[PDB]
Structures are given as structure tokens and as C-alpha cells.
Design an enzyme around this catalytic site. Sequence first.
Site, PDB file in Angstrom:
ATOM      1  NE  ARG A 130      -0.701   2.931   4.147  1.00 35.63           N
ATOM      2  CZ  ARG A 130      -2.007   2.506   3.891  1.00 35.63           C
ATOM      3  NH1 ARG A 130      -2.719   2.842   2.724  1.00 35.63           N
ATOM      4  NH2 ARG A 130      -2.571   1.581   4.718  1.00 35.63           N
ATOM      5  CG  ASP A 179      -0.352  -0.265   2.372  1.00 38.49           C
ATOM      6  OD1 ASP A 179      -0.861  -0.656   3.433  1.00 38.49           O
ATOM      7  OD2 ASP A 179       0.810   0.197   2.538  1.00 38.49           O
ATOM      8  CG  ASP A 221      -3.530  -1.826   6.666  1.00 37.74           C
ATOM      9  OD1 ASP A 221      -2.526  -1.459   6.292  1.00 37.74           O
ATOM     10  OD2 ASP A 221      -3.806  -2.161   7.794  1.00 37.74           O
ATOM     11  CB  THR A 222      -1.363  -4.127   1.863  1.00 36.10           C
ATOM     12  OG1 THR A 222      -0.625  -3.163   1.900  1.00 36.10           O
ATOM     13  CG2 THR A 222      -2.197  -4.086   0.424  1.00 36.10           C
ATOM     14  NE  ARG A 260       2.592   6.855   4.985  1.00 35.87           N
ATOM     15  CZ  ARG A 260       2.048   5.641   5.473  1.00 35.87           C
ATOM     16  NH1 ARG A 260       2.540   4.643   5.306  1.00 35.87           N
ATOM     17  NH2 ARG A 260       1.050   5.883   6.433  1.00 35.87           N
ATOM     18  CD  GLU A 284       3.941  -2.973   8.524  1.00 29.78           C
ATOM     19  OE1 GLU A 284       2.916  -2.136   8.663  1.00 29.78           O
ATOM     20  OE2 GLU A 284       4.824  -2.912   7.673  1.00 29.78           O
TER      21      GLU A 284
HETATM   22  C1  LIG Z   1      -4.492   5.247   4.755  1.00 29.06           C
HETATM   23  C2  LIG Z   1      -4.030   6.308   5.737  1.00 29.06           C
HETATM   24  C3  LIG Z   1      -3.091   6.009   6.731  1.00 29.06           C
HETATM   25  N1  LIG Z   1      -2.808   7.032   7.620  1.00 29.06           N
HETATM   26  C4  LIG Z   1      -1.819   6.755   8.618  1.00 29.06           C
HETATM   27  C5  LIG Z   1      -2.775   6.123   9.956  1.00 29.06           C
HETATM   28  C6  LIG Z   1      -1.646   5.143  10.663  1.00 29.06           C
HETATM   29  O1  LIG Z   1      -0.974   5.854  11.423  1.00 29.06           O
HETATM   30  P1  LIG Z   1      -0.350   5.340  12.688  1.00 29.06           P
HETATM   31  O2  LIG Z   1       0.621   4.099  12.484  1.00 29.06           O
HETATM   32  O3  LIG Z   1       0.366   6.475  13.460  1.00 29.06           O
HETATM   33  O4  LIG Z   1      -1.581   4.954  13.330  1.00 29.06           O
HETATM   34  C7  LIG Z   1      -0.752   4.690   9.146  1.00 29.06           C
HETATM   35  C8  LIG Z   1      -1.214   3.436   8.754  1.00 29.06           C
HETATM   36  O5  LIG Z   1      -0.355   3.230   7.418  1.00 29.06           O
HETATM   37  P2  LIG Z   1       0.431   2.122   7.311  1.00 29.06           P
HETATM   38  O6  LIG Z   1      -0.703   0.990   6.838  1.00 29.06           O
HETATM   39  O7  LIG Z   1       1.319   2.366   6.145  1.00 29.06           O
HETATM   40  O8  LIG Z   1       1.149   1.715   8.707  1.00 29.06           O
HETATM   41  O9  LIG Z   1      -0.889   5.909   8.471  1.00 29.06           O
HETATM   42  C9  LIG Z   1      -3.532   8.289   7.642  1.00 29.06           C
HETATM   43  O10 LIG Z   1      -3.238   9.149   8.378  1.00 29.06           O
HETATM   44  N2  LIG Z   1      -4.495   8.496   6.677  1.00 29.06           N
HETATM   45  C10 LIG Z   1      -4.701   7.691   5.756  1.00 29.06           C
HETATM   46  O11 LIG Z   1      -5.445   8.028   4.898  1.00 29.06           O
HETATM   47 CA   LIG Z   2      -0.292  -1.370   5.449  1.00 32.63          CA
END
Ligand SMILES: Cc1cn([C@H]2C[C@H](OP(=O)(O)O)[C@@H](COP(=O)(O)O)O2)c(=O)[nH]c1=O
Ligand SMILES: [Ca+2]
Lengths: 132, 132
Positions: free
Chosen positions: A29, A15, A34-35, A78, A37
Site C-alpha cells: 500500500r 494505491d 489515498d486514491t 500490507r 475507493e
Molecule cells: C497508507 C496507510 C494506510 N493504513 C490503513 C489506514 C486505513 O485503515 P482502516 O480502513 O481500518 O481505517 C486503511 C486505508 O487504506 P485504503 O485507502 O487501502 O483503505 O489502511 C495504515 O495503517 N497506514 C498507512 O500508512
Molecule cells: Ca484508497
Amino acid sequence: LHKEPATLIKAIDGDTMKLMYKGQPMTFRLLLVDTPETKHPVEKYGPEASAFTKKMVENAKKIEVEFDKGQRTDKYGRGLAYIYADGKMVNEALVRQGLAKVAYVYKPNNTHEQHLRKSEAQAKKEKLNIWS
Amino acid sequence: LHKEPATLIKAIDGDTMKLMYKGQPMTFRLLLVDTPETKHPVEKYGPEASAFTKKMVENAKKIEVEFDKGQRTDKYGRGLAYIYADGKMVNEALVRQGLAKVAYVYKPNNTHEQHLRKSEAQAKKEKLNIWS
Ligand SMILES: Cc1cn([C@H]2C[C@H](OP(=O)(O)O)[C@@H](COP(=O)(O)O)O2)c(=O)[nH]c1=O
Ligand SMILES: [Ca+2]
Ligand SMILES: Cc1cn([C@H]2C[C@H](OP(=O)(O)O)[C@@H](COP(=O)(O)O)O2)c(=O)[nH]c1=O
Ligand SMILES: [Ca+2]
């Protein structure tokens, strides 16, 4: 909403990817999914998802990014977008395969929420990958 | 991939049929091939392909369906599979006779792609039907 050109620099995981957008490298992103981890101390299907995305974006003629109506970047800087490889939404493609879950639905960036949700339901019905 | 039982309900055309799968009627469409059209507003060999398929599935003792690794239905709600009549793949049989072309190769449902392409090649070498 509108689609804008970008150039692939590097696929990171299911993702996340690096793109050249307006002449600047940017991590992007995927909105609304969510893909699993594979980096942070590996979830089941995390590797598959990555491969899928990596293949889909590397093989494209054209990459496009489509911001939603709200924030365009997250706290990590991102870019937040729907990303299309030759017109096929990567976000949807992953979900349709059961390689991602619809997630992180933060209003007002939720334009494609219902489309994605329905792709998820089909994937679930077909017991694919994550849903298997 | 694994073969699952099903019951013939009705042969429709060369590449489409109605089956009972897990106790529900479904239309199934053959993966990786296209038999010529006989319904949509009649291509050469369309009727021949229909007859072949109809005969092959009606005479079978057992019908099995084998989903591939991705989507299990198309946009029309048709199940997408490799179908086997007494262990013989219908998809291949048709291609081998030059009664279908390899087609609609949509990844990742492409597991048998190479096997089919080889059958096609032979049918072409032998100048069969479509290739005649
Ligand atoms: C998709 C998305 C992720 N994020 C943030 C939420 C999560 O933060 P935290 O890690 O601080 O909770 C993280 C999830 O991304 P990843 O799945 O790349 O980890 O990125 C956003 O703020 N807005 C979005 O639209
Ligand atoms: Ca992910
Ligand atoms: C064989 C196959 C067909 N299809 C679709 C593509 C074509 O859609 P369009 O009709 O919208 O182009 C149609 C071809 O089947 P038919 O040969 O029954 O027409 O069914 C799939 O989506 N996936 C498949 O695996
Ligand atoms: Ca056809």
C-alpha cells in the site's frame, strides 16, 4: 532510506498492488496518499487512479520499494512504501495529477510528506481531476 | 480539452512565448514539440522557427490556449499548452514546416500526438527545413 528491488505481480487499485518482494508475494500500500475507493461498499476518480497506477507499474522496466523509518506493514499486513517505477515515485505521480490526496500521515513514516504536499498544491492550483 | 482566450505579450523563441492568461503574465511552452535552440549555450533552424512563431502569433486576431489532460506547467513554471492563432495550432504549423520536431511526449499530455506526428511525416517526406 533506500530503494529495494521488487517485481510486479498485479495492480489492484490506485494505491494498492501485489509485488514479489524478497521472493514472497506481498500486498503493498502506498505511503502518504489515498486514491479514491473502488472496492469497498465507487468514488469519483477511483477508476482513473487505478488505471494510472496500473499503467505506470505494468510498463516499467524496474520496480523498487522504499520503506520509511517506521512500521513497514500495516494492520492488514500490507507493506507500506514509496514505490518507484523506473525511478518515478508512483505516490507522487498520482498526487501530482490530482488522482490522489495526501493522507494517512502517520509519524514517523512521513519522510516525503512535504514533497508530496507540494505536488498536491500544484495539482490543486491546476484544478486537476479531483480538484476540478 | 477546451480552448481558452489569452493575449500575446511577447514572442520569445520558436516554442516559447509570454502570454496574458486570466489576467496574469505567464510564460507558455508549446506541448509536444521542440524548436531548435537559440538561447542556451544556436542550432540550425532555431532563428527560422523563432521568426515563424513570432509572425504567426503577432498577426493573429485571437490567441487561444488549450491545456491537455495532465500537468499544466512544467518545472520552470511555464504553462504547457496547445496554442492557436486564429484557430490554427502553432504547434502543428511549426512541425508541418519542419521547423520543429515532435518531442517531449510526456503522458498523459499527449492528446494531439498523432496529429503532430503526421504533420512531421509530411514535412519529412517534403524534405523541409530541418529535414532538408
Ligand atoms: C497508507 C496507510 C494506510 N493504513 C490503513 C489506514 C486505513 O485503515 P482502516 O480502513 O481500518 O481505517 C486503511 C486505508 O487504506 P485504503 O485507502 O487501502 O483503505 O489502511 C495504515 O495503517 N497506514 C498507512 O500508512
Ligand atoms: Ca484508497
Ligand atoms: C515541452 C515540455 C518541456 N518540458 C521541459 C523538458 C526539458 O527540461 P530540461 O531542460 O530540464 O531537460 C525542457 C525542454 O524545453 P526547451 O526546449 O524550452 O528546452 O522543458 C517539460 O517538462 N514538459 C513539456 O511538456
Ligand atoms: Ca526548444
